Amino acid sequence: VDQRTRDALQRSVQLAIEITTNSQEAAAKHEAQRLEQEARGRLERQKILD
Amino acid sequence: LAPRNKTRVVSYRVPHNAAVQVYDYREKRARVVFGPELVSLGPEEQFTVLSLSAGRPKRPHARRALCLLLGPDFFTDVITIETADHARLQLQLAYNWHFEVNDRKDPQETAKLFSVPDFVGDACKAIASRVRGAVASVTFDDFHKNSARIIRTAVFGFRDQAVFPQNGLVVSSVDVQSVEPVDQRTRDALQRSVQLAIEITTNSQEAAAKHEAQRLEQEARGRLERQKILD
Amino acid sequence: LAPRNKTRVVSYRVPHNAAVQVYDYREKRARVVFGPELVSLGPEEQFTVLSLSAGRPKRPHARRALCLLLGPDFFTDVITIETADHARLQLQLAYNWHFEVNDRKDPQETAKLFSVPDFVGDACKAIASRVRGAVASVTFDDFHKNSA
């Protein structure tokens, strides 16, 4: 019945959306770091072979 | 239009896959007429007029009719629900139904098609209550990624069809059409999510290109050093 | 146009790969006429008019017709979907269909072609629900590279 209550719940749903976007950005950052380290390791082994 | 002749036998042509109910108030005898037969009233018989539901949010008392069509039709309803994350969002569903009349010669089975005089509003509010109840304990992300299975489990049970045994109305399918948030801020927040996904994809292709460039650069450098020592 | 002679036998020429349904309300007998035959009504027979779906987003009740064409045609629909990355994007699809009539002499099989009086809106919303449901759990990059 109270409008303030519904307005308070809108902040809850926008915080849930912000949480989901932060989660996908963190997953992308960790995949980027894994590929970066794999390429760096292959590059170092190739420099020693050269 | 033009007036009808009150002295002529009042009659009506029942379509294919339809039925009418008509009770002889004098001779005390009911009959349900199926198929594409032509129905002609006796001197004291009357029709059973069906007050049905229609419209886009399925309001009641919106389509009065005279015969009952029991074919594989569908009707579509708009359902506003809210999730466990308090995400208000509205749906558009589609409901394949038909009537299972086992025997058309049975006076007791075929009477039950008119046992429920608003077979559309009943089924639509029933499926609305079921879907609304099951989604209210499901978060927004799970619902967005799995909303076919959620609603198909909410409507049916533990089952391929949702039979309604008061009148024999099965519901054989549900077809979700449009799921969008009621709140504009919600949609605006999701636009930032999709543009971040695109930026992630471009950063991934740029990193892959950089690592391929570094591999070719080191290979050429190694061949150059071996050639300088040979010279 | 010019008025028709009400006293003449009302008749209609069914095309190739088509059918009509017509029920004799007096003699209590239905018949489904196939092929390119010419159909002539008895004194109490009537046609079954089909209210179909048409248009670019496939609205309902947009093309009333009289005979049923059961050939290898296609109809095209526009489907707005959304992916697991919340990418709203619309499609244009094309649906090769035909009717499988095993026996044209069977009164019960051939009655079922008119069992569903809007065979276009039904199939298009059904394929819309299926595609919309399956793509909603697939990310945007996978869908763009593998959407066939």
Ligand SMILES: NC(=O)c1ccc[n+]([C@@H]2O[C@H](COP(=O)([O-])OP(=O)(O)OC[C@H]3O[C@@H](n4cnc5c(N)ncnc54)[C@H](O)[C@@H]3O)[C@@H](O)[C@H]2O)c1
């Ligand atoms: N198999 C199919 O896919 C199929 C077959 C026939 C018709 N259709 C059409 O699909 C459309 C869906 O639109 P909607 O439901 O959003 O519009 P709506 O909500 O206004 O339709 C109300 C529903 O009530 C039903 N109805 C009306 N009068 C009736 C009677 N006398 N007896 C029994 N049932 C009756 C109709 O079939 C319709 O589906 C219908 O208008 C219908 O003509 C589909």
Ligand SMILES: NC(=O)c1ccc[n+]([C@@H]2O[C@H](COP(=O)([O-])OP(=O)(O)OC[C@H]3O[C@@H](n4cnc5c(N)ncnc54)[C@H](O)[C@@H]3O)[C@@H](O)[C@H]2O)c1
């Ligand atoms: N094999 C083929 O590729 C082939 C064959 C014939 C026609 N076509 C044409 O392809 C076009 C596709 O356009 P669209 O579907 O976007 O336009 P649309 O969506 O307006 O067409 C509606 C569909 O309903 C069908 N239809 C109309 N009246 C009918 C009846 N009485 N009985 C049975 N079916 C009926 C038509 O075949 C058409 O495909 C059609 O207009 C059709 O003429 C293709």
